Design a protein around this ligand. Structure first.
Ligand code: A4P
Ligand code: CL
Ligand code: MG
Length: 158
């Protein structure tokens, strides 16, 4: 199943954190990377007193189940010193977020898919669109349309 993963980092040299993530991800069992988007520098979504983010999107083919994929990505995060912080949107070495999991819709204790609020987030939407311009969400909403009917800010490349 094609799992679209969003990679983010704005601490401990984002480019290295991201390359690391990309190596571990393909190292995931029964999985391989179809595609990776470009590397983008994006402004913090919340508080501004932190560095810009490196953001990317990956198409990972995987035979793992959704929450099984989460155990794996979360290991990698932990491996990259990502810290559980109280308040959201503060900075962090690594984020591996499952944006979409095939065409599925998951609303479990641990997993919400498609990722909460991702339809309002250019740092998630632009890389994704780069690698799947033809993508349609489970509710039928088309990605190219979503990106067309609001002038979401253009991404600068990292
Ligand atoms: N430019 C830019 N600005 C950003 C960026 C970014 O990439 N780029 N990212 C964030 C944080 O993203 P965001 O998740 O909304 O906020 P967080 O601080 O991460 O807070 P959080 O997501 O509520 O906490 P978390 O540690 O990410 O995650 C807490 C729990 O959510 C659960 N979880 C539920 N659904 C998912 C999913 N689809 N993918 C991954 N994890 C998912 C898992 O069971 C997980 O243990 C803020 N600003
Ligand atoms: Cl949807
Ligand atoms: Mg998060």
């Amino acid at each position: 199943t094609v799992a679209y993963i969003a990679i983010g980092s704005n601490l401990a040299s984002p480019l290295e954190q991201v390359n690391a993530a990309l190596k571990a991800l393909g190292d995931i069992p029964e999985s391989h990377i179809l595609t990776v988007s470009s590397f983008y520098r994006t402004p913090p979504l919340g508080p501004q007193d932190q560095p810009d983010y490196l953001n990317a999107a990956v198409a990972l083919e995987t035979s793992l189940a959704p929450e099984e994929l989460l155990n794996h990505t979360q290991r990698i995060e932990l491996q990259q010193g990502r810290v559980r912080k109280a308040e959201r949107w503060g900075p962090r070495t690594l984020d591996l977020d499952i944006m979409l999991f095939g065409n599925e819709v998951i609303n479990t204790e641990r997993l919400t898919v498609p990722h909460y609020d991702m339809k309002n987030r250019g740092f998630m939407l632009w890389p994704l669109f780069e690698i799947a311009p033809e993508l349609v969400f489970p509710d039928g909403e088309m990605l190219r349309q979503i990106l067309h009917t609001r002038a979401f800010d253009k991404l600068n490349k990292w």
